[PDB]
Amino acid sequence: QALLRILKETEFKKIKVLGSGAFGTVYKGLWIPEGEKVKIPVAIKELREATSPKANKEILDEAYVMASVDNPHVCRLLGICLTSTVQLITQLMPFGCLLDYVREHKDNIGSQYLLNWCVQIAKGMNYLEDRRLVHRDLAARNVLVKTPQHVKITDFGRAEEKEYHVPIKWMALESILHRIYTHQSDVWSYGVTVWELMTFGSKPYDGIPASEISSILEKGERLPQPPICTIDVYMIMRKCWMIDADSRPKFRELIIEFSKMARDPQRYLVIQGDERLIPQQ
Numbered sequence: 001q002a003l004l005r006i007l008k009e010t011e012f013k014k015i016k017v018l019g020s021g022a023f024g025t026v027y028k029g030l031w032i033p034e035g036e037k038v039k040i041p042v043a044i045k046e047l048r049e050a051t052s053p054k055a056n057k058e059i060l061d062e063a064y065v066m067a068s069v070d071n072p073h074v075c076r077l078l079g080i081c082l083t084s085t086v087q088l089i090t091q092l093m094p095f096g097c098l099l100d101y102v103r104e105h106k107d108n109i110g111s112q113y114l115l116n117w118c119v120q121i122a123k124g125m126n127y128l129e130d131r132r133l134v135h136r137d138l139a140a141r142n143v144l145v146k147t148p149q150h151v152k153i154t155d156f157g158r159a160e161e162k163e164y165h166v167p168i169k170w171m172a173l174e175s176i177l178h179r180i181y182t183h184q185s186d187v188w189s190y191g192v193t194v195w196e197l198m199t200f201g202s203k204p205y206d207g208i209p210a211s212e213i214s215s216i217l218e219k220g221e222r223l224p225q226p227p228i229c230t231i232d233v234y235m236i237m238r239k240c241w242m243i244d245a246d247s248r249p250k251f252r253e254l255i256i257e258f259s260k261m262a263r264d265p266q267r268y269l270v271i272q273g274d275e276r277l278i279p280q281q
């Protein structure tokens with residue numbers, strides 16, 4: 001009944017690879033916890049490199065923090081297997097990452113789904129703020145889909161591999177200029193994440209080299225208004241990208257704003273075939 005289970009190899013198996021990133025490879029798998037009978041669908045992340053006993057102490061201390069993450073909109077770390085290449089286990093999010101989901105299902109996504117994802121991501125980020133955990137890499141690739149109506153944040157930043165140069169196009173200006181990361185720099189990245197959703201997974205600052213992003217931000221340039229977005233929604237994104245971090249909304253305020261929009265979603269996002277979950281009025 002430990003918060004973080006220390007796994008043996010015999011208790012789990014990899015079924016199908018899902019993806020590889022800068023830190024490791026994720027597999028869909030099955031876990032029968034030692035002393036139990038039930039089969040639990042899991043995601044298994046195997047690190048890229050083998051680690052020493054010393055390195056593993058630093059992984060473990062972080063793993064206990066990730067096992068303490070207990071919120072409906074953030075994934076919890078369930079277990080660790082201290083094999084030579086370490087393996088990390090969560091519950092499987094069977095629909096994969098939200099970035100791929102919105103790209104693959106773009107013709108069957110309405111305003112209600114999009115605005116409810118924005119609420120849910122803000123709820124999970126407000127939980128991280130209450131825990132004093134700065135994410136440092138919020139992006140649609142780091143949001144997972146449990147069901148089409150239920151998403152969760154994962155994979156905190158530990159500075160899509162070609163998005164890292166650090167994820168410059170998601171970062172607040174003060175993070176680019178001085179490597180300052182706070183809950184308010186996570187609000188900036190939340191705004192970029194919302195832009196990704198509202199553009200069905202498009203690439204931010206497409207055509208701008210990463211090396212020029214701080215210059216264009218300093219000139220006042222920002223990501224453009226997505227075609228589906230009313231100006232009211234775009235204004236919240238723009239508030240997330242103000243240069244003064246303390247002027248940006250807080251996650252608690254973003255939950256209120258997106259929750260109100262989610263009551264009349266077709267008024268805020270205009271999608272062809274989406275004719276005019278939080279209940280709609």
Ligand SMILES: Cc1c(C#Cc2ccc(CN3CCC(CO)CC3)cc2)cc(C(F)F)c2cn([C@@H](C(=O)Nc3nccs3)c3ncn4c3CCC43CC3)nc12
Nearest residue numbers: 023043044045062063066069075076077088090154155156
């Ligand atoms: C990469 C990494 C590491 C690591 C490491 C490393 C160390 C040294 C070296 C050697 N390295 C050599 C080069 C240089 C020399 O100094 C640096 C050191 C190499 C790698 C450690 C931990 C730890 F917390 F468990 C990690 C946790 N995640 C992920 C994770 O487990 N996601 C998964 N998704 C599917 C299933 S689990 C994560 N993040 C947040 N969350 C999660 C899940 C739940 C939740 C939201 C709450 N990711 C981790």
